[PDB]
Fold RAD14.
Amino acid sequence: APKCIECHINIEMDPVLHDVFKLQVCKQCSKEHPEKYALLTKTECKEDYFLTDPELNDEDLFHRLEKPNPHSGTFARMQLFVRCEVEAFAFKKWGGEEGLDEEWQRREEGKAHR
Amino acid sequence: APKCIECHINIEMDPVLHDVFKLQVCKQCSKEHPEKYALLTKTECKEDYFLTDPELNDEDLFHRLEKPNPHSGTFARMQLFVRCEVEAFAFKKWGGEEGLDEEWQRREEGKAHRR
DNA sequence: GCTCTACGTCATCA
DNA sequence: GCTCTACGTCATCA
Ligand SMILES: [Zn+2]
Ligand SMILES: [Zn+2]
């Protein structure tokens, strides 16, 4: 029977990372590796990685988990993305982790200026 | 025998102004009163009256005629609005003809201000 | 550490 | 004298 790609031991996969994000990863390894497996809200994806609504809204581009808005169920649904997917897209977008850090810099100058 | 509200004479209403815009006006009177009856594109509505896409996209708020884009059938459809409806909404928005001018005035100052 | 839309402009592509 | 979307912050309201 198939094994978690992180630990090579667990055969019971985290339900969310597996069913929703297509990752053969166990709940414990997801906790141990947030740099890959942590779930980020849509808002966290824009502030951390400077992705736009059109790229995050693209059904064809990111897998996503939706939950009721924790502020109120009458508010727009919370959207959760897996860090490895969003990071990989942002690195292609801005050019690796350095490109991203240069774009970070670039905006502080903007906020300062403005 | 219902009459054009403008001339009170013609019995045959402009088919566009009547079917699409609900206006009991003959074609001849539409040409003689462009200040009420001229059809404006979506773009001329934003330029002339500072209405937004959300306003003009509201299906419940303006009648609209759609035509194929004259630049190309593959481009987004042309949308035609009747000046009297558009003008009346812009007069409420900006507070009359004077407020529309006052808003005109301020954007020129902005596009001198932006080098 | 919640999300959508709108303001706002203009360009670009369609 | 063609239209949509995107880029920008954001704020507001939901
Ligand atoms: Zn594991
Ligand atoms: Zn008439």
